[PDB]
C-alpha cells in the first residue's frame, strides 16, 4: 500500500484497455483485498470507461 | 543408366536379415540383422525390426552408390516351416519406400528332395 502503488495504477489505467482485480494482482501484485477501490475510485474525465455485473464479476476497461 | 546390387533377405522365426552385396556376392556390403533395431530382445522377427532395418539397407546402399536392386526370398528353409516369416513382407514393402529401384523377385527357400530326418521325435513337438 505505499506511494508507488497508486502512481505506477493511474499513469500506467486510463488507456490500459482490459482490466479487473485479477488484472492488478498479475501486473499494479500484492493486495486484492482493497483492489474492487483504487481502480472504481473516479469513474475529472480520465480514468476507466466500463462495460462491467453485480458483486458476481466486474469485467472494467478506455475517457475515449 | 543404373547399377544393380542384389538384395540377400531372409526371415524364418525370431529373426530376419536385410543383407546387400556384388550381384555375384563373393563380396558383400551393409548387412542388418533384426535384434539390432530393437533393444526389447523379445521380438527379434518383428513386422517393425525389419521395417526400421530395411532403411539401413538404403542408407548404406544409397551411400556406396547402389541406385538400384535385384531380390532374394529365403525362408528357415532346410528340413524347416518354407513358410516365410514376418520380415519377409514388411521389408519387401519398406524397401520400395526407400527410393529403391526393384527388379526380378523370386523365392529361393531351401527345398529338399527329402532325407534329413526332421526334429521333434515321432510323437512330436508339444505345451
Amino acid at each position: 500500500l505505499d506511494q508507488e502503488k497508486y502512481d505506477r495504477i493511474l499513469k500506467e489505467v486510463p488507456t490500459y484497455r482490459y482490466v479487473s482485480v485479477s488484472v492488478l494482482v498479475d501486473r499494479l501484485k500484492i493486495g486484492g483485498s482493497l483492489a474492487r477501490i483504487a481502480l472504481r475510485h473516479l469513474e475529472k474525465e480520465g480514468i476507466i470507461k466500463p462495460v462491467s455485473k453485480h458483486s458476481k464479476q466486474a469485467i472494467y476497461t478506455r475517457a475515449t | 543408366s543404373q547399377v544393380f546390387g542384389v538384395a540377400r533377405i531372409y526371415a524364418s522365426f525370431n529373426d530376419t536379415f536385410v543383407h546387400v552385396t556384388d550381384l555375384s556376392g563373393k563380396e558383400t556390403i551393409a548387412r542388418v540383422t533384426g535384434g539390432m533395431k530393437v533393444k526389447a530382445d523379445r521380438d527379434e522377427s518383428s513386422p517393425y525390426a525389419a521395417m526400421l532395418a530395411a532403411q539401413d539397407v538404403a542408407a548404406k546402399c544409397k551411400e556406396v552408390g547402389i541406385t538400384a536392386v535385384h531380390v532374394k526370398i529365403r525362408a528357415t528353409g532346410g528340413t524347416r516351416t518354407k513358410t516365410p516369416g514376418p520380415g519377409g513382407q514388411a521389408a519387401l514393402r519398406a524397401l520400395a519406400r526407400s527410393g529403391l529401384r526393384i527388379g526380378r523377385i523370386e523365392d529361393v527357400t531351401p527345398v529338399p528332395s527329402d532325407s534329413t530326418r526332421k526334429k521333434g521325435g515321432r510323437r512330436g513337438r508339444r505345451l
Binding site: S22, V51, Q57, I59 | -
Partner: protein, 206 residues
C-alpha cells in the same frame, strides 16, 4: 424510428435495438460464418438465441446433437467439478461473460472467434481401442466429423478449469485466455499442448 408508446414503458433501448433486426442484441450470428469444410453441417452459425435456452430434446433423435445450438453444446461440458452438476444458470449469467472478455480482448466478432475455436480445435487423425490382444495398435482411424466436435468442446473444458483452481482468475479470464490462445491455435492453451499429444500418437501404430 418509431417509439411503441403503449403506464408500462417496455424499453426504447431493447424495443432501437431488437425491433430495427434477429439474435442476442449484444452480439450481431448477421455476417458471421464458418471457414472450413467438414464441422459445415455439424455445428449449428445460429438459430437466434433473440437467449444464450432450448427444453432440449436433443438425445432420443441418434443425431440431432448436430440442430443443437454450439453456444447452449457449451454451457453444455462446463456442466460439472460434480458439485455444480445441474447448474445451467451459473454456467449462463459465465459464457454470457466469456463473449465479452474474447469481444474486449483482439477486438473481433467474438461469436465468430467462438466458432473458430471449433474449426482448429478438432482432433482429426485419431486412434481407437482394436480388442487387439494383451497389447496391440490404436488401428489409427479420422473419427465421422460427428464424434470430431464432440471432442473439440469436451478437450477445451478440462484445461481452462484448472486455470479457477487455486487461481486469481475467475473461466469468464481463462476460458477467454484459451480460445483467442486456441484458434492462433497456439499451445498457451491445452488443445493444440492434447489435440496435436493423439494426431501425434497416431502418426507412427499408423
Amino acid at each position: 424510428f418509431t417509439p411503441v408508446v403503449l403506464a408500462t414503458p417496455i424499453p426504447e433501448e431493447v424495443q432501437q435495438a431488437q425491433t430495427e433486426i434477429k439474435l442476442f442484441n449484444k452480439w450481431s450470428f448477421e455476417e458471421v460464418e464458418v471457414k472450413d469444410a467438414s464441422l459445415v453441417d455439424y455445428v449449428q452459425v445460429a438459430q437466434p438465441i433473440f437467449v444464450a435456452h432450448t427444453a432440449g430434446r436433443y438425445a432420443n433423435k441418434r443425431f440431432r446433437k448436430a440442430q443443437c445450438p454450439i453456444i447452449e453444446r457449451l454451457t453444455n461440458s462446463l456442466m460439472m467439478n460434480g458439485r455444480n452438476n445441474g447448474k445451467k444458470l451459473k454456467a449462463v449469467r459465465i459464457i454470457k461473460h466469456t463473449l465479452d472478455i474474447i469481444n474486449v480482448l483482439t477486438d473481433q466478432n467474438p461469436i465468430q472467434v467462438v466458432v473458430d475455436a471449433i474449426t482448429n480445435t478438432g482432433p482429426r487423425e485419431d486412434t481407437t481401442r482394436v480388442g487387439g490382444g494383451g497389447a496391440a495398435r490404436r488401428q489409427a482411424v479420422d473419427v465421422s466429423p460427428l464424434r470430431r466436435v464432440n471432442q473439440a468442446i469436451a478437450l477445451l473444458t478440462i484445461g481452462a478449469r484448472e486455470a479457477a483452481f487455486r487461481n486469481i482468475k475467475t473461466i469468464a479470464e481463462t476460458l477467454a485466455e484459451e480460445l483467442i490462445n486456441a484458434a492462433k491455435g497456439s499451445s498457451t492453451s491445452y488443445a493444440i499442448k492434447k489435440k496435436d499429444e493423439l494426431e501425434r500418437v497416431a502418426k507412427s501404430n499408423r
